Design a protein around this ligand. Structure first.
Ligand SMILES: [Zn+2]
Ligand SMILES: [Zn+2]
Lengths: 194, 269, 49, 114, 243, 179
C-alpha cells in the first residue's frame, strides 16, 4: 500500500517486565466526558476498601486536618470443594476499587465485570509509534457515589413504611434545608473551615 | 405390545377444569393420535405418540453459542436501546445471549448448516419476525416429526420439493439389495426434523401436488414443506382401523380401547 | 434415551461431585505442627460390564 | 407527558412549584439543575384507549412466507401485489378491519370507507 | 420380533412410561381472577441437571385493577414482596432513566412510563445498592458477624441461588438486569392487553421425559445418599484403620 | 517506600481494542511467543471504513492470512486502561484497612474498538468452522515438693512424664500431701 498510514507491526512487552502486572480496564458511567487529570483535586489515592458507612467515612483532607490538629473444636468439619482461583477472585473482590481526590468533592466507586475480559488485547501506540501487545486481564466499571448528599437507611425505612400515603415530593429538599446528611464536599468544606 | 411401548401419562389432580388439558388441543397435530385414548376417568390423560414421532435427547449448546459469537452479535454488555432500536434478541433455551443486527442471513445460515449436517438435527429454531425475536432449543424433551423440504426457486419454474425420482429409485435399490439409509438421505439435506414448536414459521402442504401445479370427493402458493403422507398422523391401533375416515370418531375411540383386549398371537417363542 | 444415558451423563454425574477430602493439619495449635494430613478420596473413570 | 431527565445526570425529574413566581420548575432531586415546564399538564390517567391494531411493522414483513397474498392494489404505486393481515391488537372487541401493506410503495392502507 | 425396550426384574417383563411437565426456564403469564389483590403474574421454573433438585421458583406480582399500581417481587429466601426499583438499584443500576431503558425499548411510547411512574415513586427513597441490599429477607439461617444483614450475605444470595440459569458464579448482574427487564416487559404487555393471555395447554411449552432423566434423577439422589455415607465412618475412624 | 500515587504521563494515549476468535486468542495469548516479533500487517484506507489484516506466514496456514478489521466502535469515550506494580520494599480515620495500594499507572485511553474476523473466502477459513463443529519413695517426695513449688495446679497428665514411674506408686504418694 502507498504509505499514507503509520505502519508499525507490533513489538511486545518484556517478559521480565511481564511478572507482577495486573492491567485492568476502567469505564465511567456518565454521558458527559470525564478527565480526572483535569477534574480531581489531586493527590489521588487508589485504595481497595470496604464501603460500609462510606458517607460517614472521613475524607483524606479531614484526616490531614485532624493530624495537623493532633500534632474447643469438635474435631470434625468439611470444606466442601470450591475452585481456588474463584475463591481468590472472591477474596480480591471482597473489597472493590475506589479512587477519589484529596478533597473528597468527587468520589468514584468501582465494580467488577466478568463478561468479556479474556478476548481483549491492547494496541497502545508508543512515542516512536510502537504497538505493544498487553493481553488484558479483567475490566472494571466505576460509578460516582455520594455526589448528592445521600440519605439514611433508617429514616428511609420510615418513609418506605405506610406512615404517609404519599411521601413529600420535596422531602429531600426539606432534609437538605435542615442540613441532615450533607454532601461529602460540604462536610469537607465545613471541616476545613473549622 | 407395540401400542403399549409408546405411552405417555401426565398428573393433574382430582377434579380439574375442562378447558385445561383433559380435552384435546390443536397443538397436538402430527405428534399424538387423536383417537387412541383410554376410556374411563382418564380420557385425555394418557395419550399415544405418532408413528414417526421422535423424542429429543438433548445436545450441549456451547459450540452453538461460540459459533453464534463468531458470526457476529453484540454481546449484551454494551447494548443500548437507542443506538439499536430494532435489532433482534437471541435466545438459547430461554437464555439471553445476544442481540444481532441482521436476522435473515443468520437464520438462513443456521438452516443451511443444519441441512449440511454440521449440527445435530434435533436442534430447533423459530423466527418470530412479528416480535423481532429468535429462539434456539436444544434440550431433551421436545418432540419432532419428518418433513419434505421445498425450495421456492426453480430453474424449471414455479416451486418444487427437492427430492426426485432418482433418489427414491436408489432407495428402492438399497431396500431390494437385501447403501442409502434414512440418515444417508438426511445428511445431504432432503428431509428435515421440525419440532412441536416451529410450525408457525412454516406453511404445510397436505399432498405432494395439492396446489403444486399452478364424483369422487372434494379436496396458496408459498409452501415450504409437505408431509410424507397424511395417513401418518395416527397411532398403533389406529392403523388397524380400515378406512378410518369412513366412520364416526367415538367408534374409533372404542376400537382403540377394544384392540388391546384381543387374543391371537403375541410372540413366537 | 437408554443408550444416551449409558454413553454420557454418568461420567458427568461422577465428575460433578467426586471430590471429597479431609486434610487434618492439626485441628488445634501444636502438635508441632502437625502435617497437613490429606485424606483424599475421589473417583476417576467409571466402568460397565 | 414524557419524562424528562436531568441533562447533567440521567435521573427522573419531578415537578415542583415556585413559591412566588408561580411557575412549574422541574428540579432534579439528584442535582441542583432546574427547568421551567412548557405546559401546566403534569399527570394524565387515560382510562379509555383503543390503540394498538397497527404497529409492529418491520421493513420486510413480506419476507416471511406465511402471510397470505391478494390482488388489491396500493393506492399510491398501483402495483397489484400486496400483503394483507388483520389487527395487531387483540381485545374481545377489536374490529375486522384489515391492514394492507405493499412492497412497492411500502405503505400501509386500510379497507374502511365510513 | 421382540423389539422391546423393557426391563427384566424378578422374572417379570417391565416397562416405564413417559412423564411430562411444563418446560422449565421459559416465560409464562397468567390472569388471576378479579377478587384477589393480584391480577397479572409470571413464573420461571428451573433445573440445572439436577443438583438438590434445583427447583427455585420465581414470581412477579402486580397490585390493584385504579391507584394501587405497584409492582412487587418475591425471591428466596425473602419473605417480603420486594418492590423492583430496589432490585435494580441493588444489582447496580442507580440512574433512573437507565432503569427505564432496561425495561422498555421504544422511548416514544409512554403508557409503560405512566405504568412505571408510581413504581419509581416507590423507589424514590433508596438511592444506593447496599442500602437497597440492607433490606432484610431473613427466612433463616442465623446471622453471622453482622450488624443487621450482611451485604456480603445478600450478594451471596444474588450470585449463588437466584435465577439458576444464565449464571450462578459471580459476575453477570447486567445479564440478570436485562433478563428481569424482559420479564417486566412481557408482564406489562399482558397487563396492557396489547399482547394476549398465554396458554398452558399448548404442547411445545411442555416436555416429555424418559428413562434417561428418570435414571438420572434416582441415580443422583441415591449417589448423594452414598456420598453422605462416605463422609460417614470418615469421622468415625478416630482410631485405626484405613479399611 | 516509593510514591503511593499514580503516574499521569502515560494517560494521553489512544488505545485500540480488539476481540478475537478462540483459536486465534489461544495463539495470541502465548507467553512463549510475544517477545517483540512482528506477526501481521495492516492496510487502512485514506477515508478508513475498510481495514484488512494481512497476517504473515508465521501461522503456517492452518488459519487464514486474509482477515478484516471490524471497527464496531469508531469513537470511544471514558475508557481507560491502567497497569499495576506491587510496591518496592465521627472523625475516626482508619489509614490502614490493609488496603494494598500499588504502583499503578494509567497508561492509555481506548479510542477505537475493533475485531479481527477470519475472511470466509479464504480456503483456510471455514476449515475452522468444521473444526468448531467437530469440537523410690523418699526421693520422689522431694521431687514432688519441688513440683508444687514449680506450679500449684500441676496436671495429673503432666505429672506422668515428670515421674515416668509406676502410677500406682505415684497415686499413693500423691494422696499423702495434696491434690
Ligand atoms: Zn440532576
Ligand atoms: Zn402504492
Amino acid at each position: 500500500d502507498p504509505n499514507e498510514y503509520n505502519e508499525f507491526p507490533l513489538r511486545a512487552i518484556p517478559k521480565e517486565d511481564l511478572e507482577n502486572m495486573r492491567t485492568h480496564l476502567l469505564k465511567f458511567q456518565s454521558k458527559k466526558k470525564i478527565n480526572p487529570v483535569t477534574d480531581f483535586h489531586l493527590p489521588v489515592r487508589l485504595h481497595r476498601k470496604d464501603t460500609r458507612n462510606l458517607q460517614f467515612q472521613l475524607t483524606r483532607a479531614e484526616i490531614v486536618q485532624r493530624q495537623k490538629e493532633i500534632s474447643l473444636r469438635r474435631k470434625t468439619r468439611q470444606l466442601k470443594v470450591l475452585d481456588e482461583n474463584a475463591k481468590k477472585l472472591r477474596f480480591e473482590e471482597f473489597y472493590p476499587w475506589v479512587m477519589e481526590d484529596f478533597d473528597g468533592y468527587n468520589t468514584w466507586v468501582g465494580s467488577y465485570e466478568a463478561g468479556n475480559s479474556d478476548s481483549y488485547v491492547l494496541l497502545s501506540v508508543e512515542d516512536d509509534g510502537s504497538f505493544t501487545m498487553i493481553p488484558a486481564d479483567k475490566v472494571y466499571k466505576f460509578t460516582a457515589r455520594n455526589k448528592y448528599a445521600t440519605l439514611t437507611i433508617d429514616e428511609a425505612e420510615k418513609r418506605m413504611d405506610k406512615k404517609s400515603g404519599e411521601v413529600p415530593r420535596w422531602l429531600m429538599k426539606h432534609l437538605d434545608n435542615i442540613g441532615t446528611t450533607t454532601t461529602r464536599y460540604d462536610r469537607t468544606r465545613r471541616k476545613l473551615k473549622a | 405390545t407395540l401400542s403399549h411401548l409408546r405411552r405417555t401419562n401426565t398428573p393433574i389432580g382430582r377434579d380439574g377444569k375442562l378447558a385445561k388439558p383433559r380435552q384435546l388441543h390443536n397443538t397436538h397435530w402430527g405428534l399424538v393420535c387423536p383417537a387412541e385414548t383410554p376410556e374411563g376417568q382418564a380420557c385425555g390423560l394418557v395419550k399415544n405418540l405418532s408413528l414417526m414421532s421422535c423424542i429429543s435427547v438433548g445436545t450441549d449448546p456451547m459450540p452453538i453459542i461460540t459459533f453464534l459469537s463468531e458470526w457476529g452479535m453484540e454481546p449484551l454488555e454494551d447494548y443500548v436501546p437507542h443506538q439499536s432500536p430494532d435489532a433482534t434478541r437471541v435466545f438459547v433455551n430461554g437464555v439471553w445471549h445476544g442481540v444481532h443486527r441482521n436476522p435473515a442471513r443468520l437464520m438462513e445460515t443456521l438452516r443451511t448448516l443444519r441441512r449440511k449436517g454440521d449440527i445435530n438435527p434435533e436442534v430447533s429454531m423459530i423466527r418470530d419476525i412479528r416480535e423481532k425475536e429468535l429462539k434456539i432449543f436444544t434440550d431433551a424433551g421436545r418432540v419432532y416429526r419428518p418433513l419434505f423440504i421445498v425450495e421456492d426457486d426453480e430453474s424449471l419454474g414455479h416451486k418444487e420439493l427437492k427430492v426426485r425420482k432418482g433418489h427414491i429409485a436408489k432407495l428402492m435399490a438399497t431396500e431390494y439389495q437385501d447403501e442409502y439409509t434414512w440418515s444417508s438421505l438426511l445428511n445431504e439435506g432432503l428431509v428435515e426434523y421440525i419440532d412441536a414448536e416451529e410450525e408457525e414459521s412454516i406453511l404445510i402442504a397436505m399432498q405432494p401436488e395439492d396446489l403444486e401445479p399452478a364424483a369422487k370427493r372434494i379436496r396458496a402458493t408459498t409452501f415450504t414443506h409437505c408431509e410424507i403422507h397424511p395417513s401418518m398422523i395416527l397411532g398403533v391401533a389406529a392403523s388397524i382401523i380400515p378406512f378410518p375416515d369412513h366412520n364416526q370418531s367415538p367408534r374409533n375411540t372404542y376400537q382403540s380401547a377394544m384392540g388391546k383386549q384381543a387374543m391371537g398371537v403375541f410372540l413366537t417363542n | 434415551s437408554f443408550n444416551q444415558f449409558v454413553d454420557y451423563t454418568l461420567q458427568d454425574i461422577i465428575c460433578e461431585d467426586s471430590t471429597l477430602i479431609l486434610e487434618q493439619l492439626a485441628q488445634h495449635t501444636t502438635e508441632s505442627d502437625n502435617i497437613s494430613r490429606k485424606y483424599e478420596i475421589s473417583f476417576g473413570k467409571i466402568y460397565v460390564t | 407527558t414524557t419524562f424528562r431527565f436531568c441533562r447533567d445526570c440521567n435521573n427522573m425529574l419531578y415537578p415542583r412549584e415556585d413559591k412566588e413566581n408561580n411557575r412549574l420548575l422541574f428540579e432534579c432531586r439528584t442535582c441542583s439543575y432546574v427547568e421551567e415546564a412548557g405546559s401546566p399538564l403534569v399527570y394524565r390517567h387515560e382510562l379509555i384507549t383503543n390503540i394498538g391494531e397497527t404497529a409492529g411493522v418491520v421493513q420486510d414483513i413480506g419476507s416471511d412466507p406465511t402471510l397470505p397474498r391478494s390482488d388489491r392494489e396500493c393506492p399510491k404505486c398501483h402495483s397489484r401485489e400486496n400483503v394483507f393481515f388483520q389487527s395487531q391488537q387483540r381485545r374481545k372487541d377489536t374490529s375486522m378491519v384489515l391492514f394492507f401493506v405493499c412492497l412497492s410503495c411500502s405503505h400501509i392502507f386500510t379497507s374502511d370507507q365510513k | 420380533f421382540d423389539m422391546g425396550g423393557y426391563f427384566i426384574i424378578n422374572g417379570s417383563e417391565k416397562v416405564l412410561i413417559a412423564q411430562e411437565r411444563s418446560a422449565g426456564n421459559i416465560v409464562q403469564v397468567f390472569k388471576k381472577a378479579a377478587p384477589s389483590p393480584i391480577s397479572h403474574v409470571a413464573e420461571i421454573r428451573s433445573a440445572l441437571e439436577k443438583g438438590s433438585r434445583f427447583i427455585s421458583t420465581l414470581q412477579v406480582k402486580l397490585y390493584g385493577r385504579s391507584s394501587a399500581r405497584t409492582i412487587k417481587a418475591t425471591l428466596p429466601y425473602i419473605k417480603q414482596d420486594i418492590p423492583i426499583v430496589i432490585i435494580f438499584r441493588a444489582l447496580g443500576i442507580i440512574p433512573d432513566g437507565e432503569i427505564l431503558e432496561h425495561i422498555c425499548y421504544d422511548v416514544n411510547d409512554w403508557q409503560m412510563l405512566e405504568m412505571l411512574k408510581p413504581c419509581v415513586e416507590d423507589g424514590f427513597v433508596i438511592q444506593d445498592r447496599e442500602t437497597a441490599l440492607d433490606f432484610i429477607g431473613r427466612r433463616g439461617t442465623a446471622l453471622g458477624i453482622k450488624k443487621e444483614k450482611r451485604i456480603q450475605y445478600a450478594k451471596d444470595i444474588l450470585q449463588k441461588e437466584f435465577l439458576p440459569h444464565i449464571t450462578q458464579l459471580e459476575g453477570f448482574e447486567s445479564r440478570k438486569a436485562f433478563f428481569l427487564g424482559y420479564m417486566i416487559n412481557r408482564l406489562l404487555l399482558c397487563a396492557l392487553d396489547r399482547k394476549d393471555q398465554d396458554d398452558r395447554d399448548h404442547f411445545g411449552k411442555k416436555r416429555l421425559d424418559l428413562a434417561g432423566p428418570l435414571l438420572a434423577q434416582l441415580f443422583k439422589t441415591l449417589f448423594k445418599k452414598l456420598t453422605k455415607d462416605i463422609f460417614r465412618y470418615m469421622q468415625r475412624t478416630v482410631e485405626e484403620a484405613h479399611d | 517506600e516509593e510514591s503511593l500515587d499514580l503516574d499521569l504521563e502515560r494517560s494521553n494515549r489512544q488505545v485500540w481494542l480488539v476481540r478475537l476468535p478462540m483459536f486465534l486468542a489461544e495463539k495470541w495469548r502465548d507467553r512463549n511467543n510475544l517477545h517483540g516479533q512482528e506477526l501481521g500487517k495492516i492496510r487502512i484506507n485514506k477515508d478508513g471504513s475498510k481495514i484488512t489484516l494481512l497476517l504473515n506466514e508465521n501461522d503456517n496456514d492452518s488459519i487464514p492470512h486474509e482477515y478484516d478489521l471490524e471497527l464496531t466502535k469508531k469513537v470511544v469515550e471514558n475508557e481507560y486502561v491502567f497497569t499495576e506494580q506491587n510496591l518496592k520494599k465521627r472523625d475516626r480515620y482508619i489509614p490502614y484497612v490493609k488496603t494494598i495500594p500499588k504502583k499503578t499507572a494509567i497508561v492509555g485511553t481506548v479510542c477505537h474498538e475493533c475485531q479481527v474476523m477470519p475472511s470466509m473466502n479464504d480456503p483456510n477459513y471455514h476449515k475452522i468452522v468444521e473444526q468448531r463443529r467437530n469440537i523410690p519413695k523418699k526421693e520422689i517426695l522431694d521431687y514432688l515438693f519441688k513440683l508444687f513449688d514449680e506450679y500449684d495446679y500441676w496436671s495429673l497428665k503432666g505429672l506422668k512424664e515428670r515421674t515416668r514411674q509406676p502410677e500406682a506408686h505415684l497415686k499413693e504418694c500423691l494422696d499423702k500431701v495434696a491434690t
